[PDB]
Amino acid sequence: DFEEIPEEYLQ
Amino acid sequence: EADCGLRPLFEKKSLEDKTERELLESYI
Amino acid sequence: IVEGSDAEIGMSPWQVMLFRKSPQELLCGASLISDRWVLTAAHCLLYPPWDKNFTENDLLVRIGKHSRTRYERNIEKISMLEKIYIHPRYNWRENLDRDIALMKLKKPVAFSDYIHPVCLPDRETAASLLQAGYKGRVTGWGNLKETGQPSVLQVVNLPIVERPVCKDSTRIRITDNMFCAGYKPDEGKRGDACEGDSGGPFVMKSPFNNRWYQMGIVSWGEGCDRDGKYGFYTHVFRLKKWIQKVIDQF
Ligand SMILES: *[C@@H]1O[C@H](CO)[C@@H](O)[C@H](O)[C@H]1NC(C)=O
Ligand SMILES: NC1=NCc2ccccc21
Ligand code: NA
Ligand code: NA
């Protein structure tokens, strides 16, 4: 139930 | 480190948070 | 945190959330001790009884946060890990002795009104403040009850407990690298850390220099806020030479 974080941090 | 432990929105502005006095009062 | 309250904005600007990449979820609390170093509990990263052994690339740290679940645009900062260091004598087999780990960030984080490091204690500050009855402050996004979750960071103030009372509350072997805190049954007041608060800070405000010091790390407890039980915390000062060794060499 967490808001998606910017994809830049998961790359 | 030189500035550690001094909160921008509290100590740095000489504002106290709502419960820090409870800590101080326990330091007997 | 059980029986705490919502934090004020900027009340704990050293608070760090350990965040799992996939699935995206809270893993633990942690604290900011410089622009490049984050302190947490070793069991947040390594606990073989639960098949837990995280590597750097599994994790992010989120700093400056207040809301548990929101992406706090323009406020929080998200950092990747360069390296994890776990205390070499962390005792995950028995009692979580030396429950401490450091995480070095890939790039330094910019301080702000919401992001600021906590101090680590010197011997004298530890000797003066780590006394039974003296209160510290615990913060985290963990469960509100043992058996549910907060919208924003929670805070509770709790008294340090005499070592014999800590020992007599449990069958676990307590070491000098641990202290316990919480109210006794007849003291009336309540409060404890709970699942999800692991690795966050137990802080005290020095009355000598008006700075906040991290005296403990949320380590373990038997239930959450149970009468006659206490929360156990890693004794940061007792492990500070290891902290300094790691930082002074990496
Ligand atoms: C934890 O995992 C690392 C590799 O990711 C490995 O080197 C280490 O020995 C593991 N420790 C345990 C107790 O499984
Ligand atoms: N103090 C604590 N009670 C339950 C718990 C779980 C995890 C870490 C600390 C505690
Ligand atoms: Na005992
Ligand atoms: Na209790």
For chain C, the domains span 1-12+118-237, 13-117+238-250
Task: Give the residue on C whose Cα is nearest the Cα of A5.
Answer: C71
Kindly report the number of other CB atoms within 10 A of residue C165's CB atom.
14
Kindly report the number of other CB atoms within 10 A of residue C154's CB atom.
27
Question: CATH code at B26?
Answer: 4.10.140.10
Q: Which residue among C53, C59, C93 has the greatest number of ligand 1 atoms within 8 angstroms of its CB, and so is best to mutate?
A: C53
Neighbours of chain C (3+ CB pairs under 8 A): A, B
Cβ proximity of B10 and B17 under 8 Å: yes
Q: How far apart are CA C66 and CA C160, in angstroms?
A: 26
β-sheet bridge partners, residue C18: C28, C61
- CB burial of residue C113 (10 Å; 0-12, 13-18, 19+): middle
Kindly report the number of other CB atoms within 10 A of residue C197's CB atom.
28
> Thinking of the domain C13-117+238-250, which architecture would CATH place it in?
Beta Barrel (2.40)
- Torsion angle of the four alpha carbons C184, C186, C188, C193, in this order, in degrees rounded to the nearest 10: 20
What are the distances in angstroms from CA C137 to CA A5, C173, C228, C241, C245?
A: 29, 25, 20, 24, 27
Amino acid (one-letter) located at C52: K
How was this model experimentally determined?
X-ray
- CB burial of residue A2 (10 Å; 0-12, 13-18, 19+): middle
Kindly report the number of other CB atoms within 10 A of residue C38's CB atom.
25
Q: How far apart are CA C147 and CA C1, in angstroms?
A: 13
What is the 3-state composition of chain B as percent helix, strand, coil, each rounded to the nearest 5?
35, 0, 65
Instruction: Record the resolution, in angstroms.
Output: 1.4
Supply the range of the domain harboring residue B12: 1-28
> Token digits for C235?
């004794």
From the list B4, B5, B9, the residue facing C10 with the nearest CB is B9
Residues 6+ apart with CB under 8 A from B14: none
Q: Count Cα atoms within 13 angstroms, Cβ side, for A8.
A: 4
Instruction: Please give the tally of structural domains in chain B.
Output: 1
DSSP state letter for C199: T
